[PDB]
Amino acid sequence: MKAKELREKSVEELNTELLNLLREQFNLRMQAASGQLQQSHLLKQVRRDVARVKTLLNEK
Amino acid sequence: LKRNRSHGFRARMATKNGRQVLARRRAKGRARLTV
Amino acid sequence: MIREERLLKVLRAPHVSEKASTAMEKSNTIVLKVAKDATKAEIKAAVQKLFEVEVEVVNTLVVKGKVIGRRSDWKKAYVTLKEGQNL
Amino acid sequence: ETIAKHRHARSSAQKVRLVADLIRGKKVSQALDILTYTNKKAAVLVKKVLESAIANAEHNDGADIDDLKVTKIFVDEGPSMKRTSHITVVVSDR
Amino acid sequence: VLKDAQSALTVSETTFGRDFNEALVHQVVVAYAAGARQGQKVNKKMYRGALKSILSELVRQDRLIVVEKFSVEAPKTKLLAQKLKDMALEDVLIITGELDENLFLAARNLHKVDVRDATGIDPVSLIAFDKVVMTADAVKQVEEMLA
Amino acid sequence: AAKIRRDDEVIVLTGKDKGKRGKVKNVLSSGKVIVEGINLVKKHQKPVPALNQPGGIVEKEAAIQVSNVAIFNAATGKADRVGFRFEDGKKVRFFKSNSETI
RNA sequence: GCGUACACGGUGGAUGCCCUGGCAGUCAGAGGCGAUGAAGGACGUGCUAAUCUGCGAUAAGCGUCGGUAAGGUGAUAUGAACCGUUAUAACCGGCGAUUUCCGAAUGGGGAAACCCAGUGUGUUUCGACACACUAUCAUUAACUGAAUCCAUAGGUUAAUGAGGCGAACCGGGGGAACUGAAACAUCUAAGUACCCCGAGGAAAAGAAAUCAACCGAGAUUCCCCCAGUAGCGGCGAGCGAACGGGGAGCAGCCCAGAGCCUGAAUCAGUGUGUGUGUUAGUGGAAGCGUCUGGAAAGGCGCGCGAUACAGGGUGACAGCCCCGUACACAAAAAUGCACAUGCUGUGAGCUCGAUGAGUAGGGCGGGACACGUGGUAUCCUGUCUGAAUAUGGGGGGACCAUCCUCCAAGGCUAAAUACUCCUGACUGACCGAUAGUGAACCAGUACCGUGAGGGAAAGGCGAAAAGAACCCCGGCGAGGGGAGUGAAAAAGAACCUGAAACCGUGUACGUACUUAUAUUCUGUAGCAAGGUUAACCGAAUAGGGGAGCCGAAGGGAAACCGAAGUUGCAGGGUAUUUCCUGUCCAACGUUAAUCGGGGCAGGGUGAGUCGAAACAGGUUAAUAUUCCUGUACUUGGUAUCAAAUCGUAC
């Protein structure tokens, strides 16, 4: 988890993070605004994942 | 607008009097030094 | 408008209200929150990219928060669709 | 022995005291009949207190409903911010 | 009167036999108590006189015991406990010369038992404890220092 | 390095549960220890139409300080001290009185 | 109608108890932070309506390495929802990235969190977006370069120390009044308050052309004694010394111009390896029964460890319940100090000569020096004069004679030393919410004032929320009564004990001279012609430290004859968003108001044709010519598309 995605090149990391931002964040926000999403751990999980991904791509 | 021009943060800080009164207010610890 | 990260950071979440509820069926109009900027073209492009719903007219207005405590003023956007509808 | 006290009543002490002075030592039914037509504002409050007391007594001491008698009714000055008051009623068959 | 070797010890009369001076002892103890970092200096000769007077008072009450030696083979508090139980001593003081590391280490936890060297003897320690156990070398060191 | 953890048997030294054994369920972040059948309470739950209210009076368990309970070992049948000792690769708890291994 | 005493209650806040708080000190660090963006603020920051705290669009957290690791997702303060449980849950620490805006702010404007620029690079779509750069002295050299051919003044280029904040202190320059003289001039007041300046953690000074004079030791820096003595002072109040005689520490050197042998201790910065601290941590002893007691840690009985009875929590005071203490250990990486170790530069002593020339001094005029130019001493002027070099110079105590450290016109010198904005540890015969801090509480908060500035009241449930289920009256509120948890509800949240003052019903009867410097007297005690030793050393009220302050085999005229004082103490006197929707009558309405001119939560403002271009109708509880209905109209690009931000209620 912490280092599983370290080896893969930058292009796939960028693709994954942009896909996450475009789909998961928007879906979670829509569900939260509409009253759905009884479980909110998805927001924290995606936020942590994107933070980890963007922390890379600069030192590499 | 006269109040802002006269006792504004920048208006005071322009002169040394504003800086010293700001330091005194900081020492006192009031939430707002000027407004 | 080559970059796509900027546009997707404008809209935050939809707004739910009785007037919005009536509008969703009166003319298939929706209300979506946006960021400080009021770039109508960018908002339309982002909506088209995300929901794949064509938009013809977007109406933007500014709302000031109510109080000392203060809240950031927010931009309200009404978007209408020809025939498609989305959540 | 049934006790019922209403606290923080928004009424001056003197008016409630002088209203209750006309009910102390008299039968519950007779006092109720007298106060049915009373127009004083404190009359409504004292009626509420006494009817609540009688209802509680019947709920817990339903026996001998007819012979209920007013025993110890009084008013005391209440918290001051229009000074409030506390109206207390103790009622029993004897 | 060593109580262990039936050996008598020679002591100066002026040390353990001088007349008790209540006022001087009271002044010295008051000064010592007040000299605990609360808002007194005492003359050296007055201090020596107070120490000699209190020692004489304790001697005439049979509250002081002298032994040939006092040491523990190992730094174990059990040995000291057994040794003090042998003489039926519970709240007593130990006065000696050079401080023994093992004995001091073992006696550290004992609230009722405290060990001190000849040079580090004070009226408070002597009075706070019912009896004191002393050694001949300690006796002569005290005689020399107090004069 | 808590001396009490999940899935253990303990005995309440004092607090109306003297001589009665129990099984520890969980320990609160503040040190409170919950042990089955040590202190039964009749808390009155606030009625609520939603959340599938059980109704009546809920018979849950209260919380007591860990100081009032002690580890129990079936080898001797009496509570004793518990210490920590280093094993070949890890550190594990152990009792006293010949130091039965956990 | 009242009174004489008690009980039952109320606004009630003194006493009693609690401290998650303050106040006074000691020991060490640091003794400052900051454009690679300081201190302080605005705004976001979670499943969340508000606060502390962390964080800064990666926003109660992200990457790597170590400890514990089965609980955790920080708390107020619950609830829904998840991960892991033997090493990728979470917590702590080293090393890094991110580090919104204002704030010296330093891209421009500007009103703090607001609006808008220029340069290079990055460009699946050169419309749009991302990173870096910006305003100041001269120095290195260059592009260069008027007056004035060269040259200079000046602009630019790549770097260097700075242009702010912060408690005290070093030294210097300015700088008033209040005061004794019952007012006042010289003094004191007072070099006091206050402003500025150089860098600092300490600073200045710091090693003799200094002192007595015919005898001596010479660095500066602080301290008791000398000495509160001389002297000054309407000789009154008061101020106030040194060569001299003891402790902390005591290191004097560099150039002065030539050489000799020289990379010879050593200086300053950077690797290597060890130890001891810091930045997470591990192990670390022992008991029960019995009786009250809600609960024992309380009484009683017998035992155990103790290198650990310091301390805290645990249903009442606990060595043997837990956390801890001493003690024994521990560092992947960073970090202060010690050394041996490698390198870029000064980097041992010896001989030859010397003591730093417009220099000291003097004449035209003034600085604080009481001395304003008076007989007038001290740096020097805008100005003139002005000999040397141990063979010479300065100083004297009567001058001649004779004596003394030393060599002035080049510099430095960490050692003992004042202070605490802050960090870590401890103590207090210090205080208990009108005390203690202005503030123990969401306090430098509410509140007052244009600003400056001034500045409060308000702390407490319960051992454990186990927070009164359930039922009834009641208006679905508010409130109360049964039952029950609870020891106790004479603990019910407006929540510790609860007195009076004031108001109700019943009961028996009539109707405020302060620490402190001295003087004197009283008691008490050591020693004894002796004791008393200050500052300091010090295993610390022990032992040393008699450079002092008094008395005395002396008295006496200095011819002569031959004993008892001090210091410790205690006692005393004297000298000084207002629009609408849902809720409510509680803060207000000169009665009530379930009414409102009143609080809370939500909603509402829609633009190419409102600021060359739009007319009529409809719209919700409030907005329109803006949203829909009929299309029309000005401009531009390619029948088709577009014309930004900003306010449209009152």
Author numbering:
A (entry chain Y): 1 to 60
B (entry chain 2): 10 to 44
C (entry chain T): 1 to 67, 74 to 93
D (entry chain S): 2 to 82, 98 to 110
E (entry chain E): 4 to 42, 94 to 201
F (entry chain U): 1 to 102
Text lifted from the article:
The E. coli 50S large ribosomal subunit is composed of 33 proteins (L-proteins), one 23S and one 5S rRNA. The 23S rRNA consists of six architectural domains that, stabilized by the L-proteins, define the shape of the 50S subunit with its three protuberances. Here, we present a biochemical and cryo-EM based analysis of the earliest period of 50S assembly, utilizing an in vitro reconstitution system with purified rRNA and L-protein components. Taken together, early 50S assembly occurs in a domain-wise fashion, while late 50S assembly proceeds incrementally.
